[PDB]
Symmetry: C5
């Protein structure tokens, strides 16, 4: 369970797509924090994730609701998600930063 | 321990029923975040879970108390519940979003 | 490790005692969240737990300080305590809800 | 796998806390869960610090939490495990500040 | 999994560099809390970490955004990073304190 640092930045329509690699290994994203960037406005920001569900259909789940003067950072504690996954801002202009661990298994 | 994205949205007249069907494997719901939706009033929101306790009886349980201008998101850190589970808003109009993992055994 | 839902509501004159039976397994309370109920006043609420320490004596312990307009909910991340455990409000009138898991060997 | 006992203490401006090992064989761990301000604490900045050995072998002071009654009365650390010997103290603020956690033992 | 206490302080002109000197065992930095020091102004503080991604390249990630009058402490719950790691203030002058665990197999 070797682990690499992971991160991305979201904007109004700057998605992040985490893909499956053409390796033989398993991969997981263990999401840790969502936090507002210095230039973010004091509006509501909602970060959303999209991935396969249990019965096979795409699901969109909101990870966090952030606002600069109320809650600039949310800690998710190692939210593990199997790729492919898309991360995006459902509202707010961002930037919103996401940090976490990229877990593989050779 | 296979792992899928889970999410739902609750409103005052909209609960969520997590079931698990005529499967053979064991299933667990691992709840990660509870967060207020973009249009939610600045009223008190209380999210409830109902499931079996160890004595065999159904128990109603408060997961989180949320308020948009005080605490829009609560992180539960992987709160596991054995299905069947009903999730509902005990008060507040929502929308309230819940995200987590659906974990499956064999 | 079997896990069942656990929850309770605490008020000024209402301790909560956890419990077990003529049982054969190991039991743990895994406390998850502490949250103020809808009718709680905007007073400071302090939730306390009491259980035996490593020496063997009962020790009272503050789990959380809550205030409705400041921090209505606290997440403990799976705080595990061996029964018997008493939960109570050391101050505030409540209602205060506690949620967690009952774990069985 | 290890056995777990409830742990707690109260810190004030002139009352620190030191984690007591004894003439025993067991490996002990202190797992800290919450830091929360007591009812009578004033509304100043409170900073809780922990003191224990680092890897290279010499003592390090470390900040666990910054708390303020009207902003953030409780901080949950999620099971911060520290090997004894460890000392907990207020680096500033008058308290009382309560600490809760687990005392874990295994051999 | 031997476990030692870890800490550092960050300022506008003072970063922290975590190297384990090449022994033969493996080391991990497990971050726990990011908190503002007593002397910090009430400006936005953003703490970032730099290490390798899975493709071998260095990446910088924001760990936490703090502000004294809003949220002086963020708890990361054991965010493990493989050394070498750089911690720095991307904005704000600090001091910002970091605590966690240094783990050796
Ligand atoms: Cl706040």
């Amino acid at each position: 369970p070797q682990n690499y640092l992971f991160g991305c930045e979201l904007k109004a329509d700057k998605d992040y797509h985490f893909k499956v690699d053409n390796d033989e290994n398993e991969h997981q994203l263990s999401l840790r924090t969502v936090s507002l960037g210095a230039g973010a406005k004091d509006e509501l920001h909602i970060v959303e994730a999209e991935a396969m569900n249990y019965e096979g259909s795409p699901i969109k789940v909101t990870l966090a609701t952030l606002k600069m003067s109320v809650q600039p950072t949310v800690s998710l504690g190692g939210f593990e998600i199997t790729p492919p996954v898309v991360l995006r801002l459902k509202c707010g202009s961002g930037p919103v930063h996401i940090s976490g661990q990229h877990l593989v298994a050779v």
